[PDB]
Structure formats: structure tokens, C-alpha cells
Amino acid sequence: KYRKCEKAGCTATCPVCFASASERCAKNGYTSRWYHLSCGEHFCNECFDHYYRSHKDGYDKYTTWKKIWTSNGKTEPSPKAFMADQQLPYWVQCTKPECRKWRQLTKEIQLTPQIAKTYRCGMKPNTKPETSDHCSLPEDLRVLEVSNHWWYSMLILPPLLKDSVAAPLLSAYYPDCVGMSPSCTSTVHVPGMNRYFQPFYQPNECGKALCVRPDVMELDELYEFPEYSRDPTMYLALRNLILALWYTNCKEALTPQKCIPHIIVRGLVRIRCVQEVERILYFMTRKGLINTGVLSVGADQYLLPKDYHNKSVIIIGAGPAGLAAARQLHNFGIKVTVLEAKDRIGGRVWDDKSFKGVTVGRGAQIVNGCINNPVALMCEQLGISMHKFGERCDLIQEGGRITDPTIDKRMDFHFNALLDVVSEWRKDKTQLQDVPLGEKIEEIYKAFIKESGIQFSELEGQVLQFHLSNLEYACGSNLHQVSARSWDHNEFFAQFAGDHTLLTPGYSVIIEKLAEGLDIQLKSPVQCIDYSGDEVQVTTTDGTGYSAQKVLVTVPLALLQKGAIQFNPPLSEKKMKAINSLGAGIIEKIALQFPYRFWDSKVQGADFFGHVPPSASKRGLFAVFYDMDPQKKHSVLMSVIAGEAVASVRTLDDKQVLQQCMATLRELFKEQEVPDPTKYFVTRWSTDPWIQMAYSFVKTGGSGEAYDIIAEDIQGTVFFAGEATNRHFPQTVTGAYLSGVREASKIAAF
Ligand SMILES: Cc1cc2nc3c(=O)[nH]c(=O)nc-3n(C[C@H](O)[C@H](O)[C@H](O)COP(=O)(O)OP(=O)(O)OC[C@H]3O[C@@H](n4cnc5c(N)ncnc54)[C@H](O)[C@@H]3O)c2cc1C
Ligand SMILES: [Zn+2]
Ligand SMILES: [Zn+2]
Ligand SMILES: [Zn+2]
């Protein structure tokens, strides 16, 4: 007794039963109720009853299904859910480029990714027609409707994907909560021996960098796609599938064409899903979640639609951030020029390649926490290996004695309790009450000695000094410059989990790949940035002018501080306050080649050894020596000068620094002979005019917020990236890289 849909504002002139399950099916006629799934998809009450009522013959099928559904999912197992999960026909799009018509498949045909890839109109049960005349039959008029605004509004139930590539990573979630089907027999990390790809948080898991909640839409996602606010399921299913596809093949661009065949769901909704996967892809690409790293893009090929292509950008600095942003923008199809002061790219990445059998970094060479680390992604993309550091680091004393592990551990413990008293002391203190971390530590240690009567030996004091110099190394400063309140501010945010590694082939392999074929001008030090006009006007020191709509600054913090780039309009007081609130931390490195591996019998394959400092005054003077060949075949050691020791070396030439280091080595290996080095370098980052630092840290009275402030764009035309702009991940090549990706996403938007 009804031929119109049950639902208000349904646009279906003629509801038709897709089910035809009952002999008594209402077909294209009247029923007591026309059950709505979509504007183009209904079933009659007779067919409803065919499954739902215990006396009808479709009851076994429904009840069986409902059991599976209930034991696997958290969604109500209605007849509608059953119809959409098990009964609706599959729709597939003709892959002939001149055709592209969507076709409904006959009730019995099971869609597979192979059908999706090869489909042409008129393809019968077994997969290609004689002529392509089947293509000329008009498209069901329902197809055109799917892409309406009000069509999605009238979906009563969300799509649930079958055999999602994401499934194996979402075992811990209810499939439906994550946009997958509770009935697919399908019911951790992405496949790989390194295990570095862990894109999803486990249920209620936090504290792991770059993980995404597979069951929740973030704010940046709801803002881009607000149509999903009532039910995120569809977005989540497609975003999750997209992440899983990207990580299973990170070496090629992930396109809609690659995703289409992996979206298996019944009904007209599959069309909506196919039409959305494109938009979601573009969002995620822009954001740098996929289609990123050192992805090789064709000259003609661009990752974003021509819509984004009417922008030009000057990027200042060809370090990791500058190159990350340049690669992204260039891949997007945006016109980018990189201006670099030095005669090379890389910035604080600078690899020496002249030592036989190893590559040794003058700057960065460690990766701290490889899980979800873009550096590990780019390593994967390049098929290069990293070396995970071993645990063992003997503290050798001058004279040759190896410190007892219990002393090392006891004084490591006490070092950490000192840090805990500091974090106790500071919780209530304001910025204006900040005290140098070094002062706080010395104070606390004194009060501990005093009101406990505990007294440490000389050796114990010296081991404590070793652990102290590690923090100085980590901060890139003597602790008397470092904020007690804020030194580890970034630790508040999820950090990168997993391996700490030596990047054996060096960061330069990554840096060079990122830079490949980009418009990079070397020895083009920027002196002036003028954005007061319609275009940004950039002028190098020699006077060459460049203009673009947008400028990205990635110069080291020390260079901003020294005001090497004139900004007009000048930077805000707020920005300058932030800039000066951060310290330009410094370490220097020494590499030493020896005729043979003299240290092997004492060190026994460890990746590094420590140098117990003879005094507080010497503590950062070559505290750790790194065996630069994890293959244990070549003989190159590297060491580090940190803390007050960096100042001490400023007046020494390379040979004296070398002699100092050899004297150290001779003392550590006092009982034996140490051969002279055949080759070395000593770095001088602090007097390198375009760098003048190693990495930022928060000065006394500073805040981690300074990192966000430096990162804030001006007027949507001047953008900042770099290590010193990454609040979550300061200091590292990783953080620098991600800052550049961050800015390209900002720049590519509007
Ligand atoms: C000795 C040392 C050891 C380190 N150890 C590690 C490590 O193990 N792991 C790790 O992750 N990080 C390490 N770091 C830090 C890491 O190298 C930096 O955080 C990272 O290189 C910063 O990248 P960036 O793009 O922000 O800046 P940079 O790498 O400093 O690049 C900025 C570019 O800006 C250019 N520039 C400056 N002024 C101008 C101008 N006026 N015009 C044009 N160009 C200009 C510079 O020449 C430079 O090439 C180390 C650094 C040093 C120095
Ligand atoms: Zn029916
Ligand atoms: Zn309807
Ligand atoms: Zn066709």
C-alpha cells in the first residue's frame, strides 16, 4: 500500500526492491513499507520479512550472519545492515578512458580487486567484449546522483570495507569502529623486518610520535571534511586504507587509481567512496602523511591538482628543512627556488666520503627513535641500512682501567634523581623564576650531600661528571646556560619510539636525493627579504634579486639571532623575543682514521666507549668515542667536544685538538700502544659563518613555546621552518625535515 520511500526528502521517484528475495517481492510496486538504504537503493517489506521473521525461509541466512556480526562488531545487526553488508549488488567503473561508466553487477558476481582493475562494460562472468559498444549503453541515472551533497545526507548506514589492506594493523579494534566489515573473514606494524612503520595507535595508546588514531577523526580532518561530523566511519575507513597502502609501497606515488581496487563494498556507496578517496588522498599528500620522503616524481606528474599549482615560492636554505619543503612543493606541482648561502647543500648534514670504507658525518649521523621516523621512511625508500647501536659503553678511565658497571649504574641513577628533584622544583616556578639547570643541579647535589651524610668517592664523582656531560652534549650547551624549567619541554609531547641508529651511509644520501633536480642556487646567501609589496622580494649579498609570492625561511637559529637576513617589514617583537630566548647550542666532532683497529682487544666489538673525565673541567672533552664501522673491518673513531670544552678548543688549530684527542686515547689505552692517526678532521661548526651552531636548546627564562612562535607564518607570505621551529621535535634532522613538510602543507593550502 505504498510506492514512495519511508524516508523524508527521499528523491527516489520509484523505489525498487534490489533484494528480490521473497517470491512475494514488491519489485517496482507497492509495499506496506519501502525500506531505505540510499536514494537509489530500497527493499520491500516482503523481502525484509523474508530474512527477519522466523517463519520465512531467509531467516537462517540472516540469523547466521547476525551471529558473526554480533561476535565481531559493535554495530546493531538490523536487516538493513544485513542488506548493505550481504545483499546490495556491487558497482564497478568501466576502465576504458573514453567511457568510465559505472555499472551495477548482477546479484551473484563477487567484486574483487582484479575485476575493479580490468572492468569494461559488458564483461560477462569471466574476464573483454568483442567491440566496445556495450560502453554506449547509457549509465544508470542513479550514478550521477551519488555525487550530490544531499545524497550522502540520505545514506542511513556507513560503508564498511571488505578485506581492507588496513585490517592486519587494526586487529585490536572493532572492525566497524574503524570502517571495516565485521563479516569479512579478515577479522603491530606494517609488514617489514625493521618494523619501523607503526602508523596507528593501539586502543587508548599514547606517547608514540606520528601515530594516528584509526577510530577518531582529528580536528584538522573534521575541518577539511566537516560533512563527516555525524559519522566519521567512511572517512576513517578510507584514510586508514590510504595509510596502509602508502606504507606497503612507499616507493611510488599512491594515486586514486591504485586505491580504487582495494575499496570493496556493496552498493552505490562504493561510488561515493571511490569519489572521496581522491579528495582524502590530496589532503593527506598535502599534509605529508603519504607520497612524501624521497618519492621520485615524473616531470609531467604532480601530486596535487592544477588548483594548487598557481604559487611560486623561494626557500631559503638547503638543509633538511629547506629541502624537505622544496621537495614537497616541487612534487605538488608548485614552482620553487632554493637559495643556499654555502657552496653545498645539506647544512648541518655534511658527510665526509674520503675515509676508506665508511662515510663519516661532520654533522648529523644519528637517528633517535626510528619508529614512524621520516628518516627511516626515506631510508626504506632508498634501500639503505642504518646501524642500531648496541647497549655496551664501558667507562674507561685515564690510565686504562675499566670502570665497574655498578659505579656507572649507581651514578646514572643519582644523575637521574637529581633531574627528578629539578622537575619537582620547577613544576610551580614561573618563567621569571627560571634558574640555570646547572645551578639547580649543583645546588641539589650539595643539599643531598649535606642532609644525608652520603659521600661519594673521587671515581664516583667523575662518573657522575660523565653522565652530566651527556646532558650537556644533548643540550649542546654547558648546563649553566640551559633552562631548568624547560630543558626537556619537548618531552611533554609524544616522541619517536624504537631504535637509536647510526645512519651508516650518512644523512647526505637522503639530502642529495631530496635535492635531486630542484632549482637550487648555491653561494646565494640571502641578505634581504621584503614582503611589503605584492610579491616577496629576496636579495642575495651580491645583489641578485628574486621574487615569489611566498618565502620560506629555514636558516639556523644562530643566523636569525645574528640578524644576517634583513626583514622588511621587520620581524615582530614577539618573534624576536622567541628567537633570542633559545640558545644556539654547539658541539664539535673529531674523526680519526687509524692504520688498524687498535681498540678491539679492550673494547671487544662495542659501538662506543666512554672516557671518565679527570675533572668537572674536562667533562665534555671527548667523552665518547664511536667506532665508525659497524662491520668491524675499518678503523675510524669519532668523538665529540661538548659543554665548556667547546670554548676551550676555540684557540687551538686542528692539529692541537687532534693531539689533545690522541693524548686522551693514549691514556685510555695506557697499557698498550696506540698508532698515530693517518687521517682526521676537526669540525668548526661554530665559526662556520652560515651555521654557527649544532642545535637549539631553551635558554634560562625561555619556553618551548618559542618554537611555535618562530614557526608562525607572517601574513601568509613569510614562513619559517628548521630544527628551531619544531616544538615537538627540536634539534634533529627529523624535526627539521618535518618542519619543512609542515610548511609546504601550510604553503600549498591557500
Ligand atoms: C656536529 C653536529 C652533530 C649533530 N648530530 C645530530 C644527530 O646525530 N642526529 C640529528 O638528527 N641531528 C644532529 N644534529 C643537528 C641536525 O644536523 C640539525 O638539526 C639539522 O641539520 C637542522 O636542519 P635545518 O634544515 O633546520 O638547518 P641546517 O641544516 O642548518 O640548514 C640551513 C641552511 O641554511 C643555510 N643558510 C644560512 N643562512 C642563509 C642565508 N642567509 N641565505 C641562504 N641560506 C642560508 C645554511 O647554509 C644551511 O645550509 C647535529 C648537528 C651538528 C652540527
Ligand atoms: Zn523485495
Ligand atoms: Zn529512499
Ligand atoms: Zn564502458
From Swiss-Prot:
Q: Where is Zn(2+) 1 bound in this sequence?
A: C5, C10, H36, H42
Q: Please give the activity regulation comment for this entry.
A: Histone H3K4me1 and H3K4me2 demethylase activity is inhibited by DNA, this inhibition is released in complex with GLYR1.
The effect annotated for W102A is: Loss of demethylase activity. Defective in the binding of FAD
Which catalytic reaction applies to this protein?
N(6),N(6)-dimethyl-L-lysyl(4)-[histone H3] + 2 A + 2 H2O = L-lysyl(4)-[histone H3] + 2 formaldehyde + 2 AH2; N(6)-methyl-L-lysyl(4)-[histone H3] + A + H2O = L-lysyl(4)-[histone H3] + formaldehyde + AH2
Chain intervals annotated as zinc finger (CW-type): 85-143
| Mutagenesis / variant outcome for changing H55D | No effect on DNA or nucleosome binding
User: GO cellular component annotations, sorted alphabetically?
Assistant: chromatin; nucleoplasm; nucleosome; nucleus
Substitution effect: K67E: No effect on DNA or nucleosome binding
Record flagged with keyword Transferase: no
Mind telling me which Pfam families this protein's record contains? Amino_oxidase, SWIRM, zf-CW
A GO molecular function term, named singly, is: FAD binding
Q: Name the consequence of C5A.
A: Loss of demethylase activity
- Subcellular location(s) of the protein: Nucleus; Chromosome
Which Gene3D superfamilies does the record cross-reference, listed alphabetically? 3.30.40.100, 3.90.660.10, FAD/NAD(P)-binding domain, Winged helix-like DNA-binding domain superfamily/Winged helix DNA-binding domain
UniProt effect for mutating W91A: Loss of demethylase activity
Subunit comment for this entry? Interacts with its cofactor GLYR1 at nucleosomes; this interaction stimulates H3K4me1 and H3K4me2 demethylation. In contrast to KDM1A, does not form a complex with RCOR1/CoREST. Possible accessory component of the polycomb repressive deubiquitinase (PR-DUB) complex, at least composed of BAP1, one of ASXL1, ASXL2 or (probably) ASXL3 and one of MBD5 or MBD6. The PR-DUB core associates with a number of accessory proteins, including FOXK1, FOXK2, KDM1B, HCFC1 and OGT; KDM1B specifically associates with ASXL2 PR-DUB complexes.
Kindly provide the name given to this protein in its UniProt entry. Lysine-specific histone demethylase 2
